[PDB]
Amino acid sequence: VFKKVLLTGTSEESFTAAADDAIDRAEDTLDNVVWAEVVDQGVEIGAVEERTYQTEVQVAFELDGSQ
Amino acid sequence: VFKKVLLTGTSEESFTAAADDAIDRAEDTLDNVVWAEVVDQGVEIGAVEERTYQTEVQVAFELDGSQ
Amino acid sequence: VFKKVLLTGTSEESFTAAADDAIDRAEDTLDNVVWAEVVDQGVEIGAVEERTYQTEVQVAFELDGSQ
Amino acid sequence: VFKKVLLTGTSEESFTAAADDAIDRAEDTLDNVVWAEVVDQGVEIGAVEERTYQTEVQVAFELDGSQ
Amino acid sequence: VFKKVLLTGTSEESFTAAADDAIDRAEDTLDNVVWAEVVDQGVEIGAVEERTYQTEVQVAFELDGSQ
Amino acid sequence: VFKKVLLTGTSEESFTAAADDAIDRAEDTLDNVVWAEVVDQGVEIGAVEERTYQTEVQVAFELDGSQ
Amino acid sequence: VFKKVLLTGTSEESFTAAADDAIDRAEDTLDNVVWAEVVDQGVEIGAVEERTYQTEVQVAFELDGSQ
Amino acid sequence: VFKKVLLTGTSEESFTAAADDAIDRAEDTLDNVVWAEVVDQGVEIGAVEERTYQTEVQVAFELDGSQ
Amino acid sequence: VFKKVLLTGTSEESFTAAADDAIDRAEDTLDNVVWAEVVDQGVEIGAVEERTYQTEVQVAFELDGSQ
Amino acid sequence: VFKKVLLTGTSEESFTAAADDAIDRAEDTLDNVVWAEVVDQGVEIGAVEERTYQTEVQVAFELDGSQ
Amino acid sequence: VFKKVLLTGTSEESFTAAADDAIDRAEDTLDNVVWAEVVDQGVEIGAVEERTYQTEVQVAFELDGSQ
Amino acid sequence: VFKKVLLTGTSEESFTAAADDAIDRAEDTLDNVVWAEVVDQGVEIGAVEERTYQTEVQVAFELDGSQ
Ligand SMILES: Cc1cc2nc3c(=O)[nH]c(=O)nc-3n(C[C@H](O)[C@H](O)[C@H](O)CO)c2cc1C
Ligand SMILES: Cc1cc2nc3c(=O)[nH]c(=O)nc-3n(C[C@H](O)[C@H](O)[C@H](O)CO)c2cc1C
Ligand SMILES: Cc1cc2nc3c(=O)[nH]c(=O)nc-3n(C[C@H](O)[C@H](O)[C@H](O)CO)c2cc1C
Ligand SMILES: Cc1cc2nc3c(=O)[nH]c(=O)nc-3n(C[C@H](O)[C@H](O)[C@H](O)CO)c2cc1C
Ligand SMILES: Cc1cc2nc3c(=O)[nH]c(=O)nc-3n(C[C@H](O)[C@H](O)[C@H](O)CO)c2cc1C
Ligand SMILES: Cc1cc2nc3c(=O)[nH]c(=O)nc-3n(C[C@H](O)[C@H](O)[C@H](O)CO)c2cc1C
Ligand SMILES: Cc1cc2nc3c(=O)[nH]c(=O)nc-3n(C[C@H](O)[C@H](O)[C@H](O)CO)c2cc1C
Ligand SMILES: Cc1cc2nc3c(=O)[nH]c(=O)nc-3n(C[C@H](O)[C@H](O)[C@H](O)CO)c2cc1C
Ligand SMILES: Cc1cc2nc3c(=O)[nH]c(=O)nc-3n(C[C@H](O)[C@H](O)[C@H](O)CO)c2cc1C
Ligand SMILES: Cc1cc2nc3c(=O)[nH]c(=O)nc-3n(C[C@H](O)[C@H](O)[C@H](O)CO)c2cc1C
Ligand SMILES: Cc1cc2nc3c(=O)[nH]c(=O)nc-3n(C[C@H](O)[C@H](O)[C@H](O)CO)c2cc1C
Ligand SMILES: Cc1cc2nc3c(=O)[nH]c(=O)nc-3n(C[C@H](O)[C@H](O)[C@H](O)CO)c2cc1C
Ligand SMILES: [Cl-]
Ligand SMILES: [Cl-]
Ligand SMILES: [Cl-]
Ligand SMILES: [Cl-]
Ligand SMILES: [Cl-]
Ligand SMILES: [Cl-]
Ligand SMILES: [Cl-]
Ligand SMILES: [Cl-]
Ligand SMILES: [Mg+2]
Ligand SMILES: [Mg+2]
Ligand SMILES: [Mg+2]
Ligand SMILES: [Mg+2]
Ligand SMILES: [Mg+2]
Ligand SMILES: [Mg+2]
Ligand SMILES: [Mg+2]
Ligand SMILES: [Mg+2]
Ligand SMILES: [Mg+2]
Ligand SMILES: [Mg+2]
Ligand SMILES: [Mg+2]
Ligand SMILES: [Mg+2]
Ligand SMILES: [Mg+2]
Ligand SMILES: [Mg+2]
Ligand SMILES: [Mg+2]
Ligand SMILES: [Mg+2]
Ligand SMILES: [Mg+2]
Ligand SMILES: [Mg+2]
Ligand SMILES: [Mg+2]
Ligand SMILES: [Mg+2]
Ligand SMILES: [Mg+2]
Ligand SMILES: [Mg+2]
Ligand SMILES: [Mg+2]
Ligand SMILES: [Mg+2]
Ligand code: NA
Ligand code: NA
Ligand code: NA
Ligand code: NA
Q1: What whole-number distance in Å separates Cα of residue E37 and Cα of residue E59?
Q2: What is the CATH code of the structural domain delimited by L1-67?
């Protein structure tokens, strides 16, 4: 059984780096992370000093573990 | 990093009040709730005494916290 | 078996009241109405005296009855 | 020919009132506003004092005018 | 308030049995599971000995409990 | 001209059998049923003794008949 | 209250003429037909002598009447 | 950079002619119109003397110009 | 087993004629073409002398043949 | 690099068996088939002696091979 | 009230840089740009010397200003 | 007439580079490649040594050629 958590990563550099930010957080807290699907991308502009790219991903992990 | 939980709030009054019900529950259990996106709305009819409006929301919260 | 009819309710007050308008009509003509799913919302402006909120719902009813 | 502008209205009261906020702004600046279609709804939470409901609408107006 | 978890069940027999696999896991760990909505289906081929059917479901459970 | 009715079939066995349940009901009441398109699948859990698989289909029938 | 029926019109000439075919059938059997929304278009090839264009429309009619 | 305007053209003849109506209006008011994407089609029935076909298009134009 | 190829037909006359253009090409190269589903429509403007209507279709053909 | 072919399998038994039919055909003609994603399901009724379940899948295969 | 403009940015380097191109143009002409949502990505190949990445974004800006 | 092939490119560097990987393969085997539309993005994690970014694109090429 796989379970997915919906995380939005952020980066001041790129959409790829924002996806990595989310995946990094998932790997810090969950075992057996296996893949991530991008579901949305955007850019925060007014409210931050530098534009901040955001990439929302469903990050899937295999259970027999970490729900 | 933001994380989202998918909650369906209910209200016997309105769709707005059903969205608030879900957000209220999120704030009872999570720190740093920042926004909610409506993803579905419906009405429970047969099975309840009074029609019950339901609003499903993705409620986003900022981590460095509450996963 | 459930069957659904696609109805657009109207109200000069709110989207919730427009959903109720459609459900009310379904209950006037069908037995065993069990739930409604919102599929669209809009507002009629030019053509009416007062803005008219509209909510389109799939209204589900249980058969062994009313097709 | 109709043209649409994509506006997000806000309200501290309800989703219907947030749709009205957007339509009100359209009527302040455009002639012949004829209808609005809801395309998204959400709630701003962290960043405001009171939750702020938002309703995004495509507001249509008839040209021979106001592009 | 209902909450949903996004689980992908697997089965070497059928899509229905893969949906049951996910629901079974949800019932092992959560109280008040009430329904599941299918959101995707697929088949793992290269990487397994036997084709493995997968069915992804949003499994809903009623809170006053198990978040 | 074809017309479609939106029916949700149920089965305690499988998604295929739930699609058949809906089609069976359509054939009991309509002439010239020609095809069905699956539009949603789900499982009722809490509220029934046994899980009940549901498959929602648009069932198309040719008119010159049965509207 | 408006109600919609989902009809697929056919024509050996064009997609517009296939939409008209469906609307024509609706007007033969229902009062107060007010608009139609196109939801799908296709072409039947193998099975007919001449290609047959099909246009599926939700045809809306105002009730106080014809459900 | 390209920018798009969302226009609904109308025609008493066909969906293609309604798309042309919208594009014609865009070319009357904007420089460098390069393409149009159809996003919706429908037919106005009750409210007009003759059925009026409508085609909604995103019409794209290249800037260094006409925003 | 049916297989589909995704083709975009073009025409300087209409969307129906652009769908036919794609189907014509499929029939020139494939046996047992059975139907086509429209998936997108658009108009090429800047880059051509005359507007060129385009209709993208999934064209289905029955195998035991032409993959 | 992976490539996908869009195939509709058929079965007089079930949706799972119809997905297998498509995958079987892909494996007869392509090397390195790795997974399949279900994209549509339906049932052929009028035109066949027995209802025929159909499952449309994108079947993915790894290249360095079989385009 | 927020308003959105639909812009397609281009870059010969990356999808992130193409999103920035669109946002840059919005900031040159509009006050209070607050965020951008990615809605499509693509690559122009035949017609340019170097592949050109394109990212289409809805760029939102707060009014009390720049419609 | 344009035809599209659905390819998933991979890269250990970025989503843009994964789109290029797919396009590169298309240009190795097809004449007149004209554009690519991104349809999905994801990241392979468990199963590879280094995260592998994937970008799925519909790559369009003009026929009078390479089907
Ligand atoms: C992709 C994306 C979408 C956003 N959507 C909204 C929105 O709908 N409403 C809003 O108030 N802020 C939105 N924001 C936040 C906005 O930029 C700003 O931070 C907030 O409005 C501050 O209250 C969004 C930001 C991003 C990056
Ligand atoms: C928005 C909404 C959607 C629903 N969809 C379904 C459904 O698909 N099948 C079902 O059995 N009950 C559904 N129900 C529940 C139905 O009203 C009733 O409570 C159950 O059928 C009781 O087993 C739904 C309720 C709501 C509010
Ligand atoms: C949600 C919504 C969508 C509408 N869409 C259209 C449309 O696409 N074309 C149209 O002519 N009228 C449309 N109308 C009706 C419009 O407001 C006006 O009543 C008619 O144009 C009168 O012929 C719409 C009304 C609502 C409430
Ligand atoms: C419907 C909605 C969607 C939003 N989406 C985002 C988002 O994707 N990213 C974000 O940073 N802020 C988003 N925000 C804004 C968030 O609440 C907060 O104001 C900003 O994050 C402040 O920079 C959204 C707000 C609303 C109301
Ligand atoms: C429904 C489904 C979708 C998949 N999608 C992908 C994909 O996009 N990329 C991928 O590398 N593997 C995908 N896989 C996994 C693939 O079969 C194989 O296990 C992995 O590629 C091994 O790294 C998918 C498997 C299934 C069942
Ligand atoms: C596919 C599916 C979707 C459902 N969605 C809802 C829902 O949104 N809200 C709800 O109250 N019940 C829903 N139900 C019904 C739920 O299981 C239970 O019967 C009712 O909540 C009883 O009032 C659904 C059932 C099924 C099978
Ligand atoms: C838009 C469109 C979609 C169709 N889809 C299917 C399908 O999914 N399966 C099928 O067997 N026939 C389909 N057909 C019918 C096909 O052309 C042929 O008549 C039947 O396969 C005969 O049993 C479709 C026809 C049209 C016009
Ligand atoms: C494609 C299309 C969609 C429409 N949708 C609506 C609608 O949702 N509600 C409505 O009141 N009128 C709608 N109308 C307008 C309707 O035909 C009539 O002009 C208005 O209802 C008059 O107030 C629509 C018209 C078209 C052509
Ligand atoms: C439906 C449609 C969509 C198009 N989309 C794009 C696009 O996204 N980017 C682009 O550069 N050209 C696009 N074009 C092509 C544009 O008209 C022009 O030929 C090219 O920009 C020339 O490099 C499109 C053309 C059509 C007909
Ligand atoms: C899922 C599915 C969808 C279909 N859609 C259509 C359609 O849109 N138009 C049609 O003529 N036949 C359609 N058919 C075929 C229909 O059943 C019958 O075989 C043909 O109409 C014979 O010309 C479909 C069949 C299936 C299984
Ligand atoms: C994302 C994207 C989508 C496009 N879609 C189309 C299309 O549908 N039809 C077309 O003629 N050109 C399209 N083009 C343009 C194509 O590459 C070429 O510039 C034009 O065909 C030249 O007339 C597209 C370009 C991009 C980048
Ligand atoms: C975008 C993406 C989606 C995937 N989806 C699935 C899936 O649904 N099921 C699965 O078993 N593997 C999936 N995989 C593959 C997974 O990472 C792993 O390689 C396989 O599970 C090995 O059998 C996916 C990989 C990617 C990159
Ligand atoms: Cl989710
Ligand atoms: Cl409300
Ligand atoms: Cl429907
Ligand atoms: Cl036409
Ligand atoms: Cl495809
Ligand atoms: Cl099954
Ligand atoms: Cl728009
Ligand atoms: Cl990137
Ligand atoms: Mg930096
Ligand atoms: Mg988002
Ligand atoms: Mg009350
Ligand atoms: Mg729902
Ligand atoms: Mg009043
Ligand atoms: Mg509508
Ligand atoms: Mg107040
Ligand atoms: Mg939004
Ligand atoms: Mg076995
Ligand atoms: Mg999936
Ligand atoms: Mg049993
Ligand atoms: Mg459903
Ligand atoms: Mg003829
Ligand atoms: Mg169809
Ligand atoms: Mg005329
Ligand atoms: Mg429309
Ligand atoms: Mg000509
Ligand atoms: Mg297209
Ligand atoms: Mg049998
Ligand atoms: Mg299909
Ligand atoms: Mg360079
Ligand atoms: Mg695009
Ligand atoms: Mg590296
Ligand atoms: Mg994918
Ligand atoms: Na989730
Ligand atoms: Na219907
Ligand atoms: Na394809
Ligand atoms: Na717009």
Answers
A1: 7
A2: 3.30.1660.10
